[PDB]
Design an enzyme around this catalytic site. Sequence first.
Site, PDB file in Angstrom:
ATOM      1  N   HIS A   1       0.770  -1.262   0.000  1.00 44.84           N
ATOM      2  CA  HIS A   1       0.000   0.000   0.000  1.00 44.84           C
ATOM      3  C   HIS A   1       0.792   1.298   0.000  1.00 44.84           C
ATOM      4  O   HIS A   1       0.132   2.335   0.032  1.00 44.84           O
ATOM      5  CB  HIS A   1      -0.981   0.032   1.191  1.00 44.84           C
TER       6      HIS A   1
ATOM      7  N   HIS B   1      -3.072  -2.738   8.242  1.00 43.86           N
ATOM      8  CA  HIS B   1      -4.150  -3.166   7.365  1.00 43.86           C
ATOM      9  C   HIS B   1      -4.788  -1.957   6.726  1.00 43.86           C
ATOM     10  O   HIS B   1      -4.966  -0.946   7.387  1.00 43.86           O
ATOM     11  CB  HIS B   1      -5.190  -3.959   8.191  1.00 43.86           C
TER      12      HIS B   1
ATOM     13  N   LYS C   1      -5.098  -9.950  -7.704  1.00 45.15           N
ATOM     14  CA  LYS C   1      -5.829  -9.219  -6.693  1.00 45.15           C
ATOM     15  C   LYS C   1      -6.774  -8.237  -7.395  1.00 45.15           C
ATOM     16  O   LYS C   1      -6.345  -7.507  -8.283  1.00 45.15           O
ATOM     17  CB  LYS C   1      -4.874  -8.507  -5.742  1.00 45.15           C
TER      18      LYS C   1
END
Length: 122
Positions: free
Chosen positions: A15, A119, A43
């Site tokens: 990310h 996350h 993904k």
Amino acid sequence: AAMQDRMYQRFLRQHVDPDATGGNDAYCNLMMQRRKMTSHYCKRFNTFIHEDIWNIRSICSTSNIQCKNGQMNCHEGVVKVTDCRETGSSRAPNCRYRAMASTRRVVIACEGNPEVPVHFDK
């Protein structure tokens, strides 16, 4: 916290890309591959954050909010991103994406001491 560090490193890999500002489709195609989200299946959606790590980590220090899964260790902030969405046709490991660059609200979960992102929630 070999664990918390592994989770943080995974967040960085999936990310974080500070010095892009906002990619096009080729940026998504390259980064999804290089950040290891395409070898075995494509993904379907992923977000890359274009901010310095200090600034991303600062989001952890804001008021706690609920994560999608019900946890209470989430935090919101507004950051530059590239969102990557799989085109629908593609066959791993040759995954293809459409990019959308914007500045938007994101939600992340944080853990540890110091608190770090582990996350990407939305």
